[PDB]
Amino acid sequence: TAHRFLFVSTPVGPLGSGRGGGVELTLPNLAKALTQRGHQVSVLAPAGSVLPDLPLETVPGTWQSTAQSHGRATPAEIPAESVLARLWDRAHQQQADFDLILNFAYDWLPLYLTPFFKTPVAHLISMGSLSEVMDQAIATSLDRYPGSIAVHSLAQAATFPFGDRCLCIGNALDLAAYGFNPEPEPVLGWVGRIAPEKGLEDAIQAAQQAGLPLRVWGALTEPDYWQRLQQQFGDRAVSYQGFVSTDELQRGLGRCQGLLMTPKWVEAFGNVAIEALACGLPVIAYARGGPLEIIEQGKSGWLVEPDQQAALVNAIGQLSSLDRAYCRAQAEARFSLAAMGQRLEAWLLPLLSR
Amino acid sequence: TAHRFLFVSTPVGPLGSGRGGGVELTLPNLAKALTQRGHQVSVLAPAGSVLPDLPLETVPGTWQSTAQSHGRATPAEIPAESVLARLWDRAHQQQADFDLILNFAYDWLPLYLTPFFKTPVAHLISMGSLSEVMDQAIATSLDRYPGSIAVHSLAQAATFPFGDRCLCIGNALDLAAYGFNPEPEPVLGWVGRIAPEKGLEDAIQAAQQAGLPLRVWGALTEPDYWQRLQQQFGDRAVSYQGFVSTDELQRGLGRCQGLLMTPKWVEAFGNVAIEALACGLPVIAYARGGPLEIIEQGKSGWLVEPDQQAALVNAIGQLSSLDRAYCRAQAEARFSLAAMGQRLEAWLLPLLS
Ligand SMILES: O=c1ccn([C@@H]2O[C@H](COP(=O)(O)OP(=O)(O)O)[C@@H](O)[C@H]2O)c(=O)[nH]1
Ligand SMILES: C[C@H](O)[C@H](O)C1=Nc2c(nc(N)[nH]c2=O)NC1
Ligand SMILES: C[C@H](O)[C@H](O)C1=Nc2c(nc(N)[nH]c2=O)NC1
Numbered sequence: 065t066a067h068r069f070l071f072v073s074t075p076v077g078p079l080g081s082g083r084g085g086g087v088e089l090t091l092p093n094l095a096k097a098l099t100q101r102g103h104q105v106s107v108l109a110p111a112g113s114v115l116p117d118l119p120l121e122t123v124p125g126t127w128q129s130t131a132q133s134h135g136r137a138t139p140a141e142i143p144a145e146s147v148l149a150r151l152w153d154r155a156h157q158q159q160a161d162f163d164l165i166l167n168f169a170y171d172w173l174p175l176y177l178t179p180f181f182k183t184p185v186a187h188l189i190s191m192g193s194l195s196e197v198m199d200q201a202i203a204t205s206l207d208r209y210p211g212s213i214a215v216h217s218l219a220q221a222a223t224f225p226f227g228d229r230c231l232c233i234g235n236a237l238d239l240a241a242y243g244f245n246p247e248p249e250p251v252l253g254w255v256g257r258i259a260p261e262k263g264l265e266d267a268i269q270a271a272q273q274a275g276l277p278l279r280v281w282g283a284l285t286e287p288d289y290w291q292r293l294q295q296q297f298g299d300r301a302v303s304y305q306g307f308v309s310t311d312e313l314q315r316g317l318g319r320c321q322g323l324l325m326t327p328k329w330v331e332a333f334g335n336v337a338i339e340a341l342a343c344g345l346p347v348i349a350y351a352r353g354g355p356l357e358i359i360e361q362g363k364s365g366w367l368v369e370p371d372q373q374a375a376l377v378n379a380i381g382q383l384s385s386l387d388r389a390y391c392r393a394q395a396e397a398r399f400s401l402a403a404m405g406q407r408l409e410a411w412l413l414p415l416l417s418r
Numbered sequence: 419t420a421h422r423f424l425f426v427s428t429p430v431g432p433l434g435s436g437r438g439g440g441v442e443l444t445l446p447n448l449a450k451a452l453t454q455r456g457h458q459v460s461v462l463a464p465a466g467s468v469l470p471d472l473p474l475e476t477v478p479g480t481w482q483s484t485a486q487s488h489g490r491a492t493p494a495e496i497p498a499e500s501v502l503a504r505l506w507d508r509a510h511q512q513q514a515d516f517d518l519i520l521n522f523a524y525d526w527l528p529l530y531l532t533p534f535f536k537t538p539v540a541h542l543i544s545m546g547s548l549s550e551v552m553d554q555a556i557a558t559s560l561d562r563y564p565g566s567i568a569v570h571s572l573a574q575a576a577t578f579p580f581g582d583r584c585l586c587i588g589n590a591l592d593l594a595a596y597g598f599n600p601e602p603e604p605v606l607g608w609v610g611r612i613a614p615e616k617g618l619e620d621a622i623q624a625a626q627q628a629g630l631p632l633r634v635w636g637a638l639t640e641p642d643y644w645q646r647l648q649q650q651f652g653d654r655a656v657s658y659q660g661f662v663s664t665d666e667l668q669r670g671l672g673r674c675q676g677l678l679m680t681p682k683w684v685e686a687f688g689n690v691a692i693e694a695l696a697c698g699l700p701v702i703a704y705a706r707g708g709p710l711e712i713i714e715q716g717k718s719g720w721l722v723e724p725d726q727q728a729a730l731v732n733a734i735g736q737l738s739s740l741d742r743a744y745c746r747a748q749a750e751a752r753f754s755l756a757a758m759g760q761r762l763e764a765w766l767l768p769l770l771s
Contacts, residue, residue, distance in 0.1 A: 139495040142526060144550040146493075149530060156534060172496060176503060180510060180534040196498040 082283025140172035245318030494526035546577030599672030607674035617680035
């Protein structure tokens with residue numbers, strides 16, 4: 065029997081701006097996974113948002129500040145004109161139009177509201193543990209609503225004390241949108257929000273030492289940090305490609321011999337890793353966080369000692385030995401929408417009948 | 419036509435502690451105003467709250483930081499282990515046991531939560547405008563739920579641009595606990611924190627120029643400040659008579675010929691003037707804020723130019739122009755539990771469905 069789902073997006077910025085990071089890819093991909101199984105999905109998101117094909121409703125208001133820019137004792141914050149508050153008021157108004165509401169925001173409010181809704185609310189947690197108030201809000205929702213919380217990786221789950229009670233769903237891509245490129249140019253790629261946690265400094269330095277140009281795609285979400293990188297490395301240290309659509313990303317990224325992933329934080333998953341593999345691009349990453357669950361050492365990439373420049377330079381030197389077709393094959397075997405649709409249904413359907 | 423109400427207290431501290439502020443007096447007095455009319459009132463409050471005579475359930479967690487400590491653009495905040503959040507989760511769980519829920523907290527969350535409740539929620543807003551996020555939340559609940567918001571003073575109300583749509587329910591005391599003293603001693607009273615920047619020097623200086631000792635009730639935190647006062651004004655100018663518990667306050671304050679109210683504008687809202695009037699003590703207050711609405715000029719007291727010693731002294735010299743019995747009469751007509759009960763029923767009963 066087909067069901068009706070409402071997906072409520074992240075409040076940090078509009079879908080398509082890049083402010084929401086990987087959520088802006090994950091949400092529509094999970095929506096596609098369900099619509100391909102016959103369900104109806106609608107989306108609620110901040111004003112300015114764009115989404116192909118699906119019903120979308122947008123709500124004006126002030127964006128949430130990013131959780132990772134605050135320390136562990138920070139209170140939850142609700143700004144004047146908050147888009148997050150507005151989104152949840154609207155969800156509540158329309159709750160009887162859906163069988164289940166799926167929250168994508170790493171915020172206290174929607175977790176707190178869950179028992180205030182009649183319709184069931186489930187939560188996909190995008191990041192590892194960041195704050196006491198969030199840890200507690202997730203715990204409480206789990207205590208009352210077992211099975212209602214999903215995560216992307218076991219490494220992510222292990223950052224929380226209750227991580228074994230979270231379901232790991234991994235992630236998936238719309239594989240039809242990615243072209244396999246068997247013949248790369250002698251250049252490296254890096255893809256991400258241009259934000260301190262992503263460690264772009266490390267990748268610039270490693271590419272310069274390896275002697276290879278670095279092409280950078282990503283949203284300029286932190287203009288102060290971007291100017292600091294310019295101050296340190298100069299304006300000609302990276303070739304900046306802008307923030308681009310999935311179709312432009314996959315064409316550009318496919319041309320690279322490898323994707324460097326150099327996060328300062330513990331990455332929960334890292335959509336860009338699976339996007340690279342989908343284009344036949346091997347991934348060099350630190351052996352920390354989600355990439356440990358994505359890459360196969362010496363087959364689809366390199367997992368190197370965290371935070372060591374020499375290891376990254378060495379890995380760059382061993383890209384030519386990896387089979388790009390193998391990377392692509394791994395993407396097809398593991399990261400399909402069809403398989404995600406199965407995992408979503410196994411997660412969400414039992415929450416409808418209790 | 420009796421109903422069952424749930425009162426949810428302020429999250430700034432327990433009831434009985436002093437941190438609850440004016441809510442310490444207001445919530446029990448409004449509850450009595452309703453229980454004396456045959457309704458049932460239960461209370462939810464933070465851990466450590468004490469409230470004789472009413473069903474009371476307490477909730478653990480971190481106190482909310484005071485709204486006045488934050489600037490106008492600051493977001494609403496919910497701390498880890500928030501007592502405010504826990505209060506409202508617990509109210510929601512038990513909402514079907516009540517006809518109406520009355521919020522006393524000057525906080526974003528309860529206003530926002532109002533449409534998530536099936537049971538009606540009303541809000542008694544205790545302060546004037548302090549932030550954008552609180553102002554907008556009150557506006558929204560007014561637009562969606564006309565008549566659902568009350569204030570204590572017509573002024574506080576005017577600090578908001580939608581003030582005209584708030585109901586003023588005024589203020590109440592348990593007048594049966596205050597004795598009328600028709601014959602005072604030749605002394606003046608002052609009630610407040612006994613701390614710098616509270617206007618105490620202004621009052622001592624005026625009483626002294628007028629030739630009367632000053633008796634004070636309140637909290638002392640800095641004994642060095644007390645010594646400073648004694649050294650400046652002489653040890654006969656001012657004396658400490660107690661703290662502010664109702665029985666000690668009513669016994670002591672009624673002996674005064676007048677109460678001097680010399681607060682800074684921030685703390686210029688209301689309560690102690692009605693305690694004075696309830697004892698038959700006329701009030702001499704700076705002519706700003708809450709006292710403008712409470713005192714009837716030249717009848718129950720004198721409203722004077724702020725920060726001017728000559729205006730206090732002139733007023734003190736005209737305390738014999740004022741009828742103590744009339745001060746008490748005004749208290750019984752405006753500030754009784756009976757009169758508050760009437761205003762509360764007028765406010766809250768139309769909101770029942
Ligand atoms: O030019 C770009 C650069 C990045 N991205 C997207 O940015 C997201 C970054 O997500 P990831 O999970 O790698 O990191 P997060 O930002 O969530 O920490 C990925 O989904 C990319 O597809 C994009 O659409 N266009
Ligand atoms: C990085 C992750 O994909 C996502 O960009 C984020 N979501 C959120 C965030 N911060 C808040 N407060 N809420 C979110 O939904 N920071 C980052
Ligand atoms: C003045 C009022 O009676 C009461 O003392 C206050 N309540 C509150 C406050 N601040 C917050 N956040 N919430 C309250 O309920 N400050 C003062």
